[PDB]
């Protein structure tokens, strides 16, 4: 029985993945920034799927302190072979006159954090010694910026280029490392008529893709970032 | 059986076409397979694919003299009835220097390698919009999509125009609910330790690709479309500095 | 020793602009024409007032091979060549749903297969005279993202892109350096008059001729197997734009 | 009018190539240092053969914000500021599974926090100027594909990437263009000796600095946004690749 984390699956794009890979046969860790309950109801459907959940209170602003839940997550859990870095909140603030502990603040969330968690899940599935497998959630502007959200955008390219890193450098260990990059996703058709597709996505169209990456079939795959968005990135001042 | 979908693998006779249209079958698709010389493998797939309780028919596909060998392809949709799935497959590949390489040899490349996938690709896309229930087309490219192959200039200019072509595709077609996208193999065998050069070690087996393209043709992948998904054990994170 | 830079179709637009200041830079040009002669020789007698010689002949890379044989006229006139630039001609557009295979054809035959031949004689004398080159490959924008209702256009000026990486891989031994340049929006004969591009207006020919001289200068000689985008912020622009 | 430029570890490498070239081209120089004030007095000195002014200063990218206050004191000296150069320190190598958070941290730290205040300190005068501005960020080959056991040189060139795409699109409306300059192995004082880059050599610090100049010059006022980069066709090599 193997195990998947999947970080702030309380709601949202995580609470997909958590319920899904439950679904698929994985006991679960469910981490929390600030709403318990919300991790409480995934745990609870969670569980439902005939698996075990657990869930652990995760704040990744206080490092590298704040990671170690992970750990202790791991622990009650007895291993570890998935770990999904899902993304947090979103946040916009012009370039021109950002404080710094803005800037630091939003990649300490956004890919400090991840750089942690993935440490520790890499640990052990090291010592375990049957692969595991590590899904970074970005989102397009991994590939291309936000309009007044520089922070996010480059925090996004980091963990990009992290992925890369991490890929090349676990493979030995057989753990695959990849980014899954969401376009917008509602958290109806005709909805978004800026998008080719002119709806946002479904929490399932990312989880669904994040679960592929977890089965036996996805065993090529590393190193890669895979865009769900509804064509977003084709849309360019000619269309 | 009225709900049956139908998914048109070519060059499915083998290797990687014959493990998309085998997990296809699986999955629930009535499969037409089509094959360029190896009849009887062609007849082998369809055997199995009918194991799993649908329909599956085969077609000699010539891709070599165009547009009339496309034509085949319509052929095989009439036989089916319909088509929800296309899977344009990739053909072997070539090596010539640059330098040296004749104009007919350029010229053939691309006739199979981009041009008869645009034309299959119409065919399939025309029976899709009239059928008025979306469908899904998935161009197995190849990491050269994106990076040389040394000694395969021809090739990879192919491959990198079937990329373009998908999304030029996607961005066309996504009125009628058809996505388009393409798997991009790196290295895939025909072992563990066996491709030092690639970070894995290994080729990829077939199911590695089919597996992504069933997951490509699934509800599940409703939101993505006019992207290159690249399944080549880590080839693209290689550079210089992956030595030593 | 006087250099020798090709231009194909440098009669007009970004081709006379590449011609132009690669003649005030000091090579001698050849100019080629598709059915604008007078144009060609307008763009030799102005290259010519900056002290080099300039050459022009007719250009027509709708029937191949033989159509590409005009370079390796223009070569023998002019003595050597140092410097091809594949020139882009004009962007035609046609549903894909419906776009007759002749059509199809008919557009990678002059958008990539043209420049193919054209590249391989080029390089044949680089390679022969043995002091290396430079060849420009004009993309476009569509190297690397679709232009709607033009996908015969956007498949084969990816495959151009393509066929650059290959072509800067085989051809690096014989120094010869291989890059294409990919323009957004040019307009041919302001500020705010495409909003939907972040710099809000299309370029000036001079602002594509001015990085593809940058890449047959000796500073460039690091640079081998990109697409340099030259596009106002076009690739910047989603639908967050 | 003299235009003035602003490259940061200019006391050597590809820094001093771009400063030297940059006077050559008229513009009065800014030189940081970090700790070889001597090189950067050289650099200066060579610049000033140029008929141009060059000041140096001391530049203390490792403790931030108030480090980046010293790009502010040579602005003041300069008088104004119309190109910056965000150049890149010396790469660290650590494996990811074991890397201390200190030194992730202290990579990022140079690598982009650096380039991302001394950025907009330049930018804040270029709109105070009215005159547009050419801020070039050099990255690397590594902003694209990763250094293996440069887990944090990889993400935090990825970082200044993405950020230069963010300052393309929000400070175009001030007619600042920003562009990245991502070299590959870049040699520091032959045919045949990296046989693995298809050049089969490192760069030199001028074929960087060459491309730098031009992103500061009249022609290129329709780039923007980009990542040019210039890496002898290390961007080519596979595992295909051989000889």
Same mark, same amino acid.
């Given at each position: 029985?193997?195990?998947? #984390?999947?970080?702030? /699956? %309380?709601?949202?794009?995580?609470?997909?993945? @958590?319920?899904?890979? +439950? $679904?698929? *046969?994985?006991?679960?860790? #469910?981490?929390?920034? /600030? %709403?318990?309950?919300?991790?409480?109801?995934? @745990?609870?459907?969670? +569980? $439902?799927? *005939?698996?075990?959940?657990?869930?652990?209170?995760?704040?990744?602003?206080?490092?590298?302190?704040?990671?170690?839940?992970?750990?202790?997550?791991?622990?009650?859990?007895?291993?570890?072979?998935?770990?999904?870095?899902?993304?947090?909140?979103?946040?916009?603030?012009?370039?021109?006159?950002?404080?710094?502990?803005?800037?630091?603040?939003?990649?300490?969330?956004?890919?400090?954090?991840?750089?942690?968690?993935?440490?520790?899940?890499?640990?052990?599935?090291?010592?375990?010694?049957?692969?595991?497998?590590?899904?970074?959630?970005?989102?397009?502007?991994?590939?291309?910026?936000?309009?007044?959200?520089?922070?996010?955008?480059?925090?996004?390219?980091?963990?990009?280029?992290?992925?890369?890193?991490?890929?090349?450098?676990?493979?030995?260990?057989?753990?695959?490392?990849?980014?899954?990059?969401?376009?917008?996703?509602?958290?109806?058709?005709?909805?978004?008529?800026?998008?080719?597709?002119?709806?946002?996505?479904?929490?399932?169209?990312?989880?669904?893709?994040?679960?592929?990456?977890?089965?036996?079939?996805?065993?090529?795959?590393?190193?890669?970032?895979?865009?769900?968005?509804?064509?977003?990135?084709?849309?360019?001042?000619?269309?």
């Amino acid at each position: 029985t193997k195990v998947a #984390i999947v970080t702030a /699956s %309380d709601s949202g794009i995580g609470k997909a993945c @958590a319920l899904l890979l +439950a $679904q698929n *046969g994985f006991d679960i860790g #469910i981490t929390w920034h /600030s %709403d318990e309950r919300g991790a409480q109801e995934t @745990a609870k459907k969670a +569980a $439902q799927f *005939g698996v075990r959940a657990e869930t652990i209170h995760l704040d990744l602003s206080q490092l590298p302190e704040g990671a170690q839940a992970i750990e202790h997550l791991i622990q009650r859990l007895g291993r570890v072979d998935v770990l999904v870095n899902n993304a947090g909140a979103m946040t916009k603030s012009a370039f021109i006159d950002m404080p710094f502990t803005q800037w630091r603040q939003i990649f300490t969330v956004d890919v400090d954090g991840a750089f942690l968690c993935a440490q520790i899940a890499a640990r052990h599935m090291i010592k375990q010694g049957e692969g595991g497998r590590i899904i970074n959630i970005t989102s397009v502007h991994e590939h291309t910026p936000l309009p007044q959200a520089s922070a996010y955008t480059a925090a996004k390219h980091a963990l990009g280029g992290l992925t890369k890193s991490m890929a090349l450098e676990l493979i030995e260990h057989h753990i695959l490392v990849n980014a899954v990059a969401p376009g917008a996703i509602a958290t109806e058709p005709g909805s978004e008529p800026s998008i080719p597709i002119a709806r946002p996505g479904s929490t399932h169209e990312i989880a669904s893709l994040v679960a592929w990456l977890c089965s036996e079939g996805a065993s090529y795959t590393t190193g890669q970032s895979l865009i769900v968005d509804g064509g977003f990135m084709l849309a360019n001042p000619q269309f």
